[PDB]
Structure formats: structure tokens, C-alpha cells
Amino acid sequence: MPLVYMNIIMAFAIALAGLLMYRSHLMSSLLCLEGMMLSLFIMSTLIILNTHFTLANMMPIILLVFAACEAALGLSLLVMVSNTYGTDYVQNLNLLQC
Amino acid sequence: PPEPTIRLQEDPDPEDENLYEKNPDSHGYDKDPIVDLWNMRVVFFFGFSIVLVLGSTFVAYLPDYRMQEWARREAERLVKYREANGLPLMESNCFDPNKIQLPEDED
Amino acid sequence: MNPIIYTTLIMTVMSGTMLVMISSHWLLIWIGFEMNLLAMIPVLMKNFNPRATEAATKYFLTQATASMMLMMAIIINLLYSGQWTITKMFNPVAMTMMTMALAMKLGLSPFHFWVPEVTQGISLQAGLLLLTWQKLAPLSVLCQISQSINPNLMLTMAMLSILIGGWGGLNQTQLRKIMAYSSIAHMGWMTAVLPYNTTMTILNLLIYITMTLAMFMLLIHSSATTTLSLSHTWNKMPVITSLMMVTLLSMGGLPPLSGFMPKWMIIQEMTKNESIIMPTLMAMTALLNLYFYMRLAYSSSLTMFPSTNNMKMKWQFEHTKQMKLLPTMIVLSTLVLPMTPALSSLN
Amino acid sequence: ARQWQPDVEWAEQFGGAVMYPTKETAHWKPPPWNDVDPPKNLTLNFGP
Amino acid sequence: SSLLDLIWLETILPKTTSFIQMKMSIMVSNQKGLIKLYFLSFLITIMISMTLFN
Amino acid sequence: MLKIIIPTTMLLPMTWMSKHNMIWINATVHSLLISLISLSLLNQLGENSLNFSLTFFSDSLSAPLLVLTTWLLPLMLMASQSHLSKETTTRKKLYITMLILLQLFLIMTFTATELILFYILFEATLVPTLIIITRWGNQTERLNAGLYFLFYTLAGSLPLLVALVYIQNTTGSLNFLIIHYWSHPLSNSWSNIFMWLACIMAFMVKMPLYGLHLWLPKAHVEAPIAGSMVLAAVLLKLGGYGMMRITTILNPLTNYMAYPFLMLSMWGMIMTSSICLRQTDLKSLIAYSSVSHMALVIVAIMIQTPWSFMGATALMIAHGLTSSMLFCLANTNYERVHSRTMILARGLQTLLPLMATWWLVASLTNLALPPSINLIGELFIITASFSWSNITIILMGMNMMITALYSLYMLITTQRGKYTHHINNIKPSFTRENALMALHILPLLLLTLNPKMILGPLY
Amino acid sequence: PHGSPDWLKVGLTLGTSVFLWIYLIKQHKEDVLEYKRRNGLE
Amino acid sequence: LQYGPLAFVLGERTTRKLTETSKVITVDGNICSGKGRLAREIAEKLGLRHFPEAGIHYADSTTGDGKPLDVQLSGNCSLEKFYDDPKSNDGNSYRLQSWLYASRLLQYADALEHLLSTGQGVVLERSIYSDFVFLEAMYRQGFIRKQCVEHYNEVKKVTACEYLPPHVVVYVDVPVPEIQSRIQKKGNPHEMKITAAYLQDIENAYKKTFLPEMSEKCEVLQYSAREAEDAEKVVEDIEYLKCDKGPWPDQDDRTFHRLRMLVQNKLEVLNYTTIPVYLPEITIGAHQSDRVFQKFTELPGRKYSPGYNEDVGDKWIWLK
């Protein structure tokens, strides 16, 4: 496994850690999710092109579309939360607790 | 302090009702005399008369499925036989050694 | 919302789970998970209020992260061996990633934190759906790749789930939180037997779904979401409280009720594999779940709590709408122990 | 002469946010009876 | 009656178990509901899982 | 064996289809008839057993317990008839249903040819009795009592289940006949030590063993009268029956694994006996007397000699009858005074002479007065312990002393002396209570004439 | 409220029960004959 | 086919029934004022259904037989004892207030159900809205405690947050001396004990709080005693005004479906009237509750569901 795959996997892991940090600003959470998706798209495209697996050239597009739909959903949720509080801070979402 | 010292709306604790006052010779089974008399009668008949007496006489005359007298007679004839033939009464071995195969030691 | 739109959304959730269950390609399984998540969000927010929106955003965040790591596991698996079929993973690193993604999707500890809060936020019907239907797809995927899993990690999460559910349920007055912690413990029990027998996993899943359906329907019938609100139920509908007590006794694993069937068999199966310490710990831990079920029973049906005057008016009205299959769920969740050997149907 | 049944004081044990109150969780409050929390047009000046 | 039966036999088996379970339940269920802490724990668990198990 | 199981089940529809004022009569009469059917089981044979089917089997150890279980239900109905008078018809039917279900599980547990079925029914009994205690109990402590009676039990019994399934995976069966015939010795190992502990602790908790007995005084004091009768008479004997059954796979480990338990009993039976000397509650005193008698039964079972087993069977039957009678007497006093404090109502021989003679005979049977079966069990166990070690006699001997002492103390505090002046609601004894007393005590003095019926399979 | 026995529902319920019982009896007979023919009993 | 999601799916839309005549009117006036006579007249002229003011036994009239039940089974409160001894130790005042608010809430649900299911509008006396004035009055006279008013506020918030306020609120203004004279000529011994301050407080409440808050979200017709007898002018005023500020124009077919599901199923309407907050005036112990519920079940047609009582005369039980 060459170093390009290693760099893409490292980027995915960095984005996952950034999502799990939650300094504030749920918009940053969505940004980290979509950075993870971008890394996934890049690495899947590289693998599929490298192995000349023709029928799987379908797969990256599909992934993109589905993930983008999720972003839409996430954005909607963020917007609604802001309408209740005036801002999208993470610490506003403490009404429900363990 | 305008509180009523009443923590909630509760019934007072009812007092024990005597079964004898409304009905002497009450038998203590029920507050309806007819049902009470019949409860007494069924309890006494089926407990004392049926189970206690008939069950006891059934248990007394249970046939000897444990074979007490059978073992007595068998021991009697064995003792008679071993006395008549000079055998040494009970033998110290429960199983005859002829068909027990001990492991040879060779130690 | 519109009844047609609600029916369409529920059908889309069902179709996502079925697409996960019937497909042999990893991309289509991931697509089923995506469709299920996409259609599940509005259902959690059918009754609009800030709490439901917070629950929905927490649920979306957790499920989206799980889906991303799911996708990551699939890609890594593809890189090492160029296969898309769902079978035992060809890479050890990919397998662990797959395992934690499904652990988040189910709610296994330490990925359990979202379940109590999401269950509290949503209504009772949404909670019923979330705690029953939303466990089928991840568990089926886990069953399909059970020969690949590392037993150490999987059993660690199972035991952690049982312990965490038992401890967290003891501190709850809200009924939805109690249900969430109970579900966490039952997920732990189910996942403790995947490495050894998936039939036992399915048997536990079916029994648990039956009991959870009965419990949620009984909680909906007597529309109570707290301990004290349920303590008033004897003053209107005591049969409901008696059925609820018997169901709670069954859910605690007391023989000869139905809830004793899974643990028994699970314990039995683990003993076949020379595992003795883990089943013992699991049973002694399930005693905690039994304790807070017993506390609920004490508060609901074994003692009569003070009532209120306005309850008198409620005595004059009947339930207009009925849950069908509620009697069937109660009977199947209390009295099916003699039918235990039917599990050979590979249920 | 009567069987004991729970009173208001016994029922208060199960009315809080959580069992076993702690110093930290003492300030927690039970949720609203219905699961609804209180919510708690811009001006433009087109000058010369 | 008092020293052993009412005090020490109580203290050993039932009271100790009740105390420990209460303390553990308090520790487990005292979560502020802030997802910052939750996903920090998730990162911790994820990192630990990859390294420790294999 | 279905000829007893089916009628007991049919007791339920008959109770639920009865008129609102005929439930007690029908239940009592039918239950008594079922008890009569149980007598046929006694005609046991000196060889193996009455193997009725693949599922159930009877034995000269199981037969006396079955007969006592069937006989106890009519007496519990008679005792419950009084305090449930102001109770709704549906809830009275529910109470009778709990008693019938409890009897059904108990009858089944004894035939229970396999150990898993026995475990399932052994734990099934825990549900109706818990409902009885925590629903129809007077004080506020009943809830705690219930919890204790639950968790103690399960804490001992969940490991047993594991052990049980483990055995079936190694030997291949849990049928008692196959276990007995294919028995093999237990090697001295740590794993074997823990399997021995898992097998023993479940039954040792329900005896109860001294130190593990905290649940019993609670669950007996805050239970209703029927609950107390069934707890002391039969439910305590499930542990002894299970120990007698399961110790066939525990040899020769028991030859030294029994030391911690024997001690806990031999000293414990002293301690609890002394506890009876300083007691302010009748029910608590009777509960502690139960603890002492079951400590002696534990010693008998752990010694594992034919005389030990005969004495333990006899003592279990005798203690069931005597403790049920004592609880019924205490409840007759309680339903008049509503206090359950032994010092409060005094001088009752002057007001209730026939209750006084019932109290005397109950105390004399608790006394272990020859030639009662209580003495027969006591003496067989004491002789076996003397053969086990000549020093045990001291403990045994002193125990007898204390027993007699507190027993007569209970008779002198409540019956003798001067009547309490301010209590003026001591109405004459009902025919129901005198009939209950006679139906407890006459079977004891009838069993003392045919001891082989209750001396177990080693007779 | 105020409602007469809905004879349509009663008819459907009894008809479903009768159809199920008849189909069950026929199915059991067919299994018995098929098993006998396969194993050569009768 | 009872109304549900399937009926809405097939044909059932209630926006096709609204004909601008719905216009739920509510009439509010101080005790002894002729609001009832006026309300009845308005309903007669406009073709609407009049709802007589809810009493202690309003709910008794809609379920089973319309006859009221015993006081111990229905309400557990009396207005006569409130007038006689408003500061009693058994808390009749607040129990009466709470039962009347529940009755009022129940009546409003029935009125909304009729208006939505048929399209014909309705006329009401004192509704859930303006029920609070008796509350405030009882606090200002010292009859009830502050805990009672906080519990009332909690229940009122949670319940009234789900229903549409009336279009037209009609207030008949009659001064306190005039209504005192009307009470004195009434002859009712218990009504004669209403003190001047209590009547003033009721009058004060409408003017201080009820009239202004309502005017911000609906249209108000404040009338004096003299201007209230001539109902033709009242109807003219009602028909001339057009409601455009309330939530009613914003309602649509989906919101109508949710509201129509809410108004039926009276158990869901009354769900929050019994929240587990323990006030000594309204909380009832287990023994009393048990025996009273048992007595209620023993009533002739109250053991089973309405179509399953043989004693009242239900037949064909074994086939229903």
C-alpha cells in the first residue's frame, strides 16, 4: 500500500477526530462530516481506477449523491436548532441528558 | 399559617366489626349465617370425617410394597439353611472373588 | 403531518431495513442504512418541539458518523481484496472499524450515550419504533459477518453494555430513560452470543421486541411518561397495571416467564464453548435490571398511590382507539416458555 | 386495623428528575408535563 | 441480636451491595447531556480499540 | 402424577367461575379432596421409586412433602378467610389464584425428574409468594421484605443454573436417575470447588443458613398469614430437598467442603436460639426458631449418613407442621390486638382456655417432647452428629436447653400471669380458629404412630 | 356507544375460522397420506 | 367509520364545511348578568348551537345516561358550601375551581368537535379562557392559597396551549351594585352571601386582564347593561366584523386534522388535568380513592363499555 492511500486515510482520521472534538459551532461538525466524505470519495475513486474495475466507476458518484443528501438534512436540522436559540452553539443542546 | 393541618383527603380508619354482635353462634367463617353454617359443615366433614379418618385408615392398611415381611422370611430361610448346612452365617464378601479381576501389581 | 406522508416515511424506513437485509453488495447495504436514516428523522420530529429537534439532531449526528466509518470499513476491505460481497472481512483493521460502526448504530457501550437522550426527546410511538425496528439492520449485518469478528472486542462491548444498562437504569424516574437503558442491556445480551450462535441472537431479538412492544403499547394506553404519572393508573384502569406488572416481571428474566428463555439459552450456549465467568457475571448483572423493574412494579401495581380529584371525570370516558396485537404481545411476552424448543425453526 | 398504603410523602420520592439526588444534580428539574419547553421583522432606514 | 444480626450481617452482604450499586449508578447516570464530552469519549474509545485489541 | 396436577389446575377455573359468596367453600372442599388423593403416593416401595413417566417421579422423600403441600392449602384458605372479609371479589379470587399457582409449582417441583425442570419450578415459586407478600401485607416494611426475599434467593440461584447446564454439557444428562447411576467422584480441584459452591449455595440460602438468613425474619413478619404458613412449612424445605438430591454428585468433596457450613450451623443454631430469648415480636421469635431448626437440618444433610437423612426428613415435616401452627396462633392473637408485640396482651389463658391448650401443645411439639416426630428427627440427627464427632453433643445438647427455654417463655409471657386491664376486645375463639388448630395438630400426633411414612428413602 | 351486532363482521370472523379449520383438516389428511406413500406404510 | 387518518385520506376535509358562520362566539359577564339570555338569543338568531354554561355535573350529561351522578362520585365539590364557608378547611374552593376548569375544558372540546365535524358554529358562556378570574377573585378574598393558583396556572398552560381561542368575545358590563341588587331579588340564600369585594374582583379581572389580552388576538364587543337587551344590534356587530388577526385564518386542512383528532378522544383532552402534583385540597388518598372507584363501577351502566351492560338492557352481548 503506497503513501497516497496512507495520506488519504490520515486525512479521514484527522477529520473524524476533528468532528469528535466539538469545540463549538455545530456547523463545524457538519464540515468535519463532509471532509470525511470527501476523503472517502477520493480514496474509493483511486482504488477503483487503479484496479481497472469498470462497473464500480458507478460507486463514487452514488456515494457523493447520498452523502450530499445527508448534508442537506443536517443543514436543515442545524437551521431549526438556531431558530430556537439564535445560534448554533453545541452547548445549547443540553435539554436532554443521561 | 393558613394550612388546614390536613395533608390530603382521606377516609378515617374503619373499626373492627364483631362477627358475634350481629350474629351469635357465628362460627367465624362468614357474615352471612347460611353460608357460614355451610362453610363450617363442609370444613368439618371433609377435613375431620373424610381426609383425617378415612385417610388415616387408608395409610394404616397400605400393602407392604416395601417388603418388610418378605425380607424377614428370606432372612429366616437363609439362616435356617446356613445353620443346617454349617455355613458361617453372613459372609464377609458381598461379591464372590471368582469374578472380580484385580490388577496384577508386579511391583 | 399528513397521514399519507407519514405512511410513506414509515414505508421508506421499512424499505431501508429490508434493502439492508436482502442485499449481497456492501454498497447496497450502506445505501439501505442511508435511506433508513433519511426517512427516520421526520418520524422523530412528528410532534414538533425543541426537545424532539434536539433528539433528532443528536440521532442524526451519531448515525451519520457511524455511516461514515461504515463506508470507511467497506473501502479498506475493498483495497485489500477487491470484493464487494458481505462475508467475513479480509482485513483485521477493517473489521474493527466495521464493529464500532455497528456498535454506534445499535447503541452498545461505550457508544450508548445517545440512546437515553434521544428516547427521552421523542414521543412514545417514536420511541417504540426506535427501540424495536431500528435494531434489525445492524444486527442482521453483524450476523452475516459473525465469523469475522474479534471475540475480545465484541464481548467487551457486550459486557460493558449489560453493566452500563443495569447501573444507569437504577437512577431513572422517567419511563423512556428506563426503556432506553433496558434496551442497552438487552443489546449487550444479544451481542454476547454472536461469536458463538446467531440463532440465539435472533431468539433474544424476537423475545425482546415482543416484550418492548407490549411495554410501549401499555405505556401508550395509559398515557404516562413518568413514575408518578403511571402511579395514577390503578385508579382508572387496574387491568392495565396488572398486565404491566406481569410484563415487567417477564422483562426481568424471572421464570417461568418468557423473558427467562433468552438468557437461559444464551447461558447454555456459552457453557458449550467453555465460557463460565462471563455468563455468571452477566446474570448477576441482570439482577440490577430486575431491581429497577421491581421498583416500577412496586410503584404501579403492588401498592396504591394517592390520586387526585379530577381523575373522577376520567372515569366517565373510554379509550376511543385500541392497539391491536397488544393482547397477543402480552401473551407472547409472558407465556411462551413451554414452546422453547421451537427455536430450531432458526427463527 | 388497616393495610398501609403510600401517602404523599412516599410518592415524593419518585417525583424528582432522578433517584438518589446528589449535590451536583440537586439543581436539575423534571421536564415539563407536556414535552414542550417555553420559547423564552427588521427595520430598514432608506435615507437620502 | 444487635451487634451481629442487626448490624454486621446487614453491613456485609445487603447494605454494602446497595451502597456500591447506588454509587456506580450515580457515576454512570450523571452525564450533563453535552455531546462534547460524549464524542471525546468516543474518540478515546476508538483510539484504544484499534491499539489495545490487536 | 397427572391425577394430582390436573385437579389442582382445575381449581383455578372453579374459583374464577364461583359465586361471590361461595369461593371459600368450593376452594376448601376441592383442595381437601386433592389432599386425599395425595395419600395414595405414600404407598412407596423399598426399591428405586415410583417412576410415573419420563417427566415426573415420586419417592419416599418427595411423597411426605407432596402430602404436606396439598394439606397446607385448605389451612391457608381457612386462615385467610378472616382478614380478607372487606376485600373485593376479584382480589379475593386473585389471592386464591396466587395460592393455587404456588401449590401447582410446588407439587411439580418434587416429581421434577430432571434438574433443569426442578430449577425452573423452584424459581417459579418465587413469583406468587412475592406478589402475596408485597400486595396483601399490612406494614410499610413489606416492600423491603419482598426485595430481600427476592434478591438473596436469586443471588444464590443464578450460579446454580450455570453449574447445572455445565453438568449437562459434560455428563450429557440432568435426569436424576441417570445422574445417580452414572455418578463419578469429584476430584480435589479449584474448578470442582467452585462447582460445589455453585451447586450448594442456592439451596443453602433458602434453608436459610446462618449468616444468609437476614431475608427470613423480614419476609415472615411482614407477610400475611397464608404467606407465613407457606414460607415456613414448605418453602424452607425446598432447599433441604435440593441438597438431598444434588449431593450425589458432590462426593467426596463434601467430606471437607462441608466444614465451613457445619460450623456456621452448629454455632449458628445456638446464636439464633439465644436471639429467641430476647424478642419483642411473636412472628420474629417464630422465624428465628425456624432458622435454628433448619440449621440442624443443614448439619444433618452435610453429614451424609442414613440416620442423618432420616432425621432430616422427619424434622422437615415436623417443623413445617409446628411452625405453621405457631404462626396461626400468633395471628389469632394479632387479629384481636392488632399489635404483634408479645408483652402487650397477657394472661390470655384466663380468657381463651382452648387457645391456651392449643398454645401448650404447639409449644410442646416445638419443645421436641417424646415421642413426637420433632423428637424423632432431633434424636436421629443428634446421634448421627455424635458418631461424626463426640464433641457436637455439647452444642446439640445446649441447643435443646435454649429451645425449651424460649418455647416455654413464649407460653408464659402470653398465656400466664395477669390479663392486661385496658384490652376489652378479646372475643371468644371462633370455630374456624379451633378447627384450624386441630387440623394442624392432629396430623402430628397421627404421624408419630407411623414414623416410616416420614423417615425418607433410607428407612 | 349505541351499536347493534355488526353481522358483516361476525360473518367474516366465523367464515375465516371455519375456512381455517377446514383447510387445516384437509392439510393434515394430505400430509398423512403423503407420508404414508413416501415411507410405504399404507 | 369514526374519524381518523383513513377518513382524512379518502374524503374527510373540514375546510369544505366552514361557511364563515362558524365564528365561535363566547359570552362573558359578571355573575347575575343576563349573558345567558343574550347568548341564547345570539345562537337563536345566527343559527348556532348554544352551549349552556358548564356546571359541576356537565360531564355527567354527555356519558351514559344524561342524568347527573352523586356528588361523591362526580366533582366531590359543591358551590353552595363554597358560598356558605369559602374559607373552609377541606379545600372546597380550589377543588370546585379545578373541577369547573376541567368541565369547561371538556365543554370546549365538545364544542370544537361539533364545529369541526359539522361546520355549524357554536355559542358559549364563560370558557376555559376567562375561567381564571374566579381564581384571582378567590385569591384576593383570601379563600385559596398561592400553591392552588400555581397549580391552576400549570394545568391551564399545558391544556390551553393546544386549542384555538374564540373569534368573538362578548362582554356584558354590569356594575357591582346592580348585580348585588339582582342577587338580592334572586332570593337564593347562598348567593346572597357573595360579598361586595368578591363581585368587584370578578369585574376587576375582566377589565384588567381578560379584556386587554383578548383584544390583542381577537375582536371584542364590550356592552353595558342597557345595550345588551337589543340583540339585533349585537348580531349586526358580530356579522360586520371580519376576523383577520387570530390564528384561525392560518389554520389549514392538516392542522384541522390534528385538532379534530385531539377534540375527540376526551381522555387525551383531560390527560393533563390530573398531573401528579400533590395539593392537599385536590389530592386523594388510596383508601378513599379505592372505595369511591369501586362504588363508581357498581353504578348501573358503568361496569363495562357502553354496549356491554346487560343490566341496563344491552342484548347480543356474546356476538358484539
Ligand SMILES: CCCCCCCCCCCCCCCCC[C@@H](O)O[C@H](CO[C@H](O)CCCCCCCCCCCCCCC)COP(=O)(O)OCC[N+](C)(C)C
Ligand atoms: C379425649 C379423651 C380420649 C378419647 C379417645 C379414647 C381412645 C384412645 C385410643 C387412641 C390412642 C390409643 C393408642 C391406640 C393405637 C392403635 C392404632 C395403631 O395400632 O394403628 C397404627 C396405624 O396408624 C397409621 O399407620 C397412621 C395414620 C396415618 C396418618 C396420616 C395423616 C392423615 C392425613 C392428613 C394430611 C397429612 C399432612 C402431613 C403430611 C405428612 C399403627 O398400627 P400398625 O401396627 O403399624 O399397622 C396396622 C395393622 N396392620 C398390621 C394390619 C397393618
Ligand SMILES: CCCCCCCCCCCCCCCCC[C@@H](O)O[C@H](CO[C@H](O)CCCCCCCCCCCCCCC)COP(=O)(O)OCC[N+](C)(C)C
Ligand atoms: C414470541 C416469540 C416470537 C414471535 C413468533 C412469531 C409470531 C408471528 C409470526 C407469523 C408468521 C411468520 C412466519 C413467516 C412466513 C414464511 C417464513 C419463510 O418464508 O422464511 C423462513 C424463516 O422463517 C423463520 O425461520 C421461522 C419463524 C418462526 C418464529 C417462532 C420461533 C421463535 C422461538 C420459540 C418461541 C415460542 C413462539 C411460539 C408461539 C407463537 C425461511 O428462512 P431463511 O430465509 O431460509 O433463513 C434466514 C434466517 N437465517 C439467516 C437465520 C438462517
Ligand SMILES: CCCCCCCCCCCCCCCCC[C@@H](O)O[C@H](CO[C@H](O)CCCCCCCCCCCCCCC)COP(=O)(O)OCC[N+](C)(C)C
Ligand atoms: C456470611 C455467611 C456465610 C456466607 C458463605 C460462607 C461459606 C463460603 C466459604 C467457602 C468454603 C471453603 C473455600 C475454599 C476451600 C478449599 C480448602 C482451603 O480452604 O484450604 C487450603 C487452601 O489453601 C489456601 O487457603 C488458598 C486459598 C487462599 C485465598 C482464598 C480466600 C480464603 C477465604 C475467603 C472467604 C470469603 C467468603 C465470602 C466471599 C464472597 C488448603 O490448601 P492446599 O492443600 O494447598 O490446596 C487445596 C485445594 N486444591 C487442592 C484445589 C489446590
Ligand SMILES: CCCCCCCC/C=C\CCCCCCCC(=O)O[C@H](COC(=O)CCCCCCC/C=C/CCCCCCCC)COP(=O)(O)OCCN
Ligand atoms: C447468597 C449469595 C451468594 C452469591 C453467590 C455465591 C455462589 C458462588 C459460587 C461460584 C460462582 C460461579 C461458579 C461457576 C459455576 C460452576 C461451573 C464450573 O465449575 O466451571 C469451572 C469454572 O470455574 C470458575 O470459573 C469459577 C470462577 C468464579 C467467578 C465468580 C467469583 C464469585 C465469588 C468468588 C469469591 C467467593 C466465592 C464463594 C462465595 C460464597 C458466597 C458468599 C471450571 O470449569 P472449566 O474451566 O471448563 O474446567 C477447568 C479447565 N479449564
Ligand SMILES: Nc1ncnc2c1ncn2[C@@H]1O[C@H](COP(=O)(O)OP(=O)(O)O)[C@@H](O)[C@H]1O
Ligand atoms: N368559575 C366559577 N367559579 C365559581 N363559581 C362559578 C364559576 N362559574 C360560574 N359560577 C357560579 O355558577 C352560578 C351560575 O352562573 P351564572 O351564569 O352567573 O348565573 P345564571 O345561571 O342564573 O345565569 C353562579 O352562582 C356563578 O357564580
